[PDB]
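Retro notes, structure queue

What went well: the backlog is down to a handful. What didn't: a couple of records were mislabeled last round, so from now on we paste the full input next to the output in the thread. Example, using TAXI family TRAP transporter solute-binding subunit from Vibrio cholerae:
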Amino acid sequence: SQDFITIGTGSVTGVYYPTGGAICKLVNKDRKDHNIRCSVESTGGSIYNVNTIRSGELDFGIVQSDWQYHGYNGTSEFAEQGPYKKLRAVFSMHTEPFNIIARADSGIENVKDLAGKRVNIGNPGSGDRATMQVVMDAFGWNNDSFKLAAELKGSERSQALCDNKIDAFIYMVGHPNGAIKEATTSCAAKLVPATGPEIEKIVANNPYYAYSVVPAGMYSGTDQEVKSFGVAATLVTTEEVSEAVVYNLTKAVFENFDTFTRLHPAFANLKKEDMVTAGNSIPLHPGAVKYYKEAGLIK
Ligand SMILES: N[C@@H](CCC(=O)O)C(=O)O
Ligand code: NA
Ligand code: NA
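Corresponding output:
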């Protein structure tokens, strides 16, 4: 029996990393019963997580809902990898807006203003960069459309923005998170909206992109709500992982749901029924289905 699982997440100042930590705590507290030990890995993000589940070095991964769909189908960012039809959904979680964090004197007031600036578009292997490519397609942009197209991982973007190495960085991430808190607090960075006909087309044409709002007061300096588009964070796995393992992880979260929603402020408004279906477009792992049917959440 498999007795040790690893969850791939993201940069340590994001939301994926403490999300993994919360899931592993709920799994580990009953390790004397199901003999499952859970550990968390900081990684490059959604794209690395899918590819590393597939290569066998991760058992679970947290993945944006758009790259759950495209990783399973082998399309868009995953086109050269081919389909991965063993990928399975477990549950979805918080919303992740497409955030733009800019210097106060950058002149960047909307997403269209990113062209011709020094923009961190994201590290290879992050959902940040893969979804930024969707934005670039809607605008007809490539890397040369920016003065500089930097590829820093999440934990390094705020320090680069404060050092005046970039004018802005993007981040597909839930709220609040430590990366954006640092930039807005310590460097007077501003959260910039992404609206206009290009964003409207992105939302209208895809079921996994929906309008998003970050409320005023989430960060110091951003005194009005910030509109954009967002995806859902989802936990995925492979059908190679045993039904018993996925069943016990799913049960650990859903049977301790009131505890889970107290472990990070991004989980405060999660709803069990939505976690089964929302943002999940590929088959659910049989172990998760088994729990959901016991709990009355399915059929
Ligand atoms: N959605 C981001 C990660 C955000 C986070 O770390 O919370 C990515 O896939 O790269
Ligand atoms: Na949509
Ligand atoms: Na769905």
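Agreed that this is the format going forward. Reviewer comment attached to the example: Residues 277, 280-281 surround sodium ion (ligand 3) (CB under 6 Å).
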